[PDB]
Amino acid sequence: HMTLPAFKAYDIRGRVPDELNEDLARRIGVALAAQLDQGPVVLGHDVRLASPALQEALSAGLRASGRDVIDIGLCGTEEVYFQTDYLKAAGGVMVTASHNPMDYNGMKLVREQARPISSDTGLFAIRDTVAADTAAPGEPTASEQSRTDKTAYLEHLLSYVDRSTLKPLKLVVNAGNGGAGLIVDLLAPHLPFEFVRVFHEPDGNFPNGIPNPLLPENRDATAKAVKDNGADFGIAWDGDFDRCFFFDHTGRFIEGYYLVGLLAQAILAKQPGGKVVHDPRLTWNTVEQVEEAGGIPVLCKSGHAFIKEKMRSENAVYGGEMSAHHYFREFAYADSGMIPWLLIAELVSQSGRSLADLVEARMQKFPCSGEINFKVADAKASVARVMEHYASLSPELDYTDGISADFGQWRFNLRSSNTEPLLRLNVETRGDAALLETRTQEISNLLRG
Ligand SMILES: O=P(O)(O)O[C@H]1O[C@H](CO)[C@@H](O)[C@H](O)[C@H]1O
Numbered sequence: 274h275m276t277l278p279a280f281k282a283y284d285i286r287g288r289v290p291d292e293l294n295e296d297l298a299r300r301i302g303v304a305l306a307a308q309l310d311q312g313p314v315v316l317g318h319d320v321r322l323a324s325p326a327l328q329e330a331l332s333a334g335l336r337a338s339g340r341d342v343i344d345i346g347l348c349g350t351e352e353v354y355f356q357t358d359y360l361k362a363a364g365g366v367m368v369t370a371s372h373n374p375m376d377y378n379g380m381k382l383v384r385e386q387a388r389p390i391s392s393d394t395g396l397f398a399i400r401d402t403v404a405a406d407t408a409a410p411g412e413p414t415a416s417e418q419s420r421t422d423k424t425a426y427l428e429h430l431l432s433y434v435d436r437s438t439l440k441p442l443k444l445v446v447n448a449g450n451g452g453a454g455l456i457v458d459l460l461a462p463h464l465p466f467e468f469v470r471v472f473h474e475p476d477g478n479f480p481n482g483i484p485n486p487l488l489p490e491n492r493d494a495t496a497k498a499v500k501d502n503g504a505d506f507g508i509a510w511d512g513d514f515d516r517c518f519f520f521d522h523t524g525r526f527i528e529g530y531y532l533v534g535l536l537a538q539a540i541l542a543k544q545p546g547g548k549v550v551h552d553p554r555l556t557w558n559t560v561e562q563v564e565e566a567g568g569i570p571v572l573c574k575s576g577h578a579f580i581k582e583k584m585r586s587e588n589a590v591y592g593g594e595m596s597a598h599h600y601f602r603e604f605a606y607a608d609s610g611m612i613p614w615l616l617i618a619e620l621v622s623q624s625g626r627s628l629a630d631l632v633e634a635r636m637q638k639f640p641c642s643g644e645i646n647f648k649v650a651d652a653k654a655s656v657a658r659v660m661e662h663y664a665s666l667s668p669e670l671d672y673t674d675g676i677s678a679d680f681g682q683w684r685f686n687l688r689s690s691n692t693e694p695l696l697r698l699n700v701e702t703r704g705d706a707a708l709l710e711t712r713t714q715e716i717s718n719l720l721r722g
């Protein structure tokens with residue numbers, strides 16, 4: 274292997290100990306110090322068994338390079354984002370494995386204002402430094418401070434809702450033995466909600482499976498809890514809870530697409546006329562709901578780094594991806610798995626409408642395929658077959674992010690993943706479920722052919 278495999282497009286991601294270990298972690302700390310502007314570095318970690326050791330190695334390398342370290346301890350990814358920005362630190366690293374296997378771990382790195390460090394914005398520079406670094410470890414010349422106070426973070430979360438307007442909704446919450454439960458419990462004394470706690474305790478051994486609400490078996494655990502307890506709706510998170518997933522009162526999982534438009538309207542009620550950033554995979558419903566709420570929709574390439582920089586350049590109040598990532602301007606332009614369900618709970622409380630009713634007509638008006646992934650022998654040839662087949666229909670074509678083709682009553686986006694060697698397909702139609710299925714199956718056949 275010519276270069277270190279753990280260094281991916283957006284983050285560091287690999288098997289312990291051959292792709293990621295304490296030695297590499299320490300070298301990464303040293304290299305990161307050379308890439309940042311002045312200031313301390315915030316460090317946090319998730320519930321994985323190896324994460325504290327990796328964070329300590331990271332701290333050792335940073336402090337050997339004269340960087341003060343602010344250890345915010347066991348946390349969610351968004352807390353590293355928030356505290357980095359809030360404390361005006363030089364940068365931050367979250368040690369997390371997200372939903373990777375048990376023998377895996379990783380790191381998400383940010384600089385000032387929690388601005389992402391990605392492959393083309395410092396991460397491969399870090400990789401190359403680490404790759405060539407054979408120097409003996411130096412000793413720490415800077416200190417580490419423990420800062421586990423979450424008051425500022427919690428106040429920021431609560432600032433998104435008028436607590437006097439909240440109703441005592443019954444909410445299922447499913448941390449999947451990740452870290453989300455700790456924050457829910459800290460918020461609960463300040464909320465009127467009745468919580469039904471599922472897989473609630475943090476446990477890096479993951480007795481009920483690695484947190485991933487998109488897997489049907491994991492999905493059903495939240496769904497069952499909602500139905501059995503007559504909950505208003507249910508929320509589940511991934512391990513580092515920067516992704517949230519919603520289940521209405523019938524137990525039905527709500528496709529992430531529709532929450533972009535819903536959350537946009539929620540935010541626009543608080544910040545009128547604002548711009549809203551969205552990705553190009555699924556678009557029609559978002560554009561319509563944003564515009565109807567008096568907002569301005571802004572098309573952007575998918576990927577958190579693209580989304581965040583677009584929001585910054587546009588002073589956008591909110592950004593959302595169909596892949597369950599939701600970004601908020603005052604939250605350091607960063608994603609949160611907590612702010613969205615607070616906003617939705619407030620929406621349900623104030624409107625008297627169920628989460629089901631809030632999205633029902635939208636799902637009927639703009640039905641989507643869901644993201645469908647393809648691993649084929651020749652991605653480029655497969656894309657060519659699709660485009661050649663639809664040429665005679667003369668679709669409107671857009672190349673913001675792969676290929677978007679607008680045929681009038683239906684459209685698709687076809688993308689190479691930046692994080693996996695996959696093709697990703699998304700189809701939607703104008704209120705036509707039949708057209709949706711036939712076109713989705715047609716494209717599927719073409720890609721596989
Ligand atoms: O592999 P992709 O599709 O390129 O990228 C995926 O991971 C990114 C970071 O989690 C997300 O921001 C994208 O929305 C998601 O599609």
Ligand SMILES: [Mg+2]
Pocket residue numbers: 350371511512513514515516
């Ligand atoms: Mg995550």
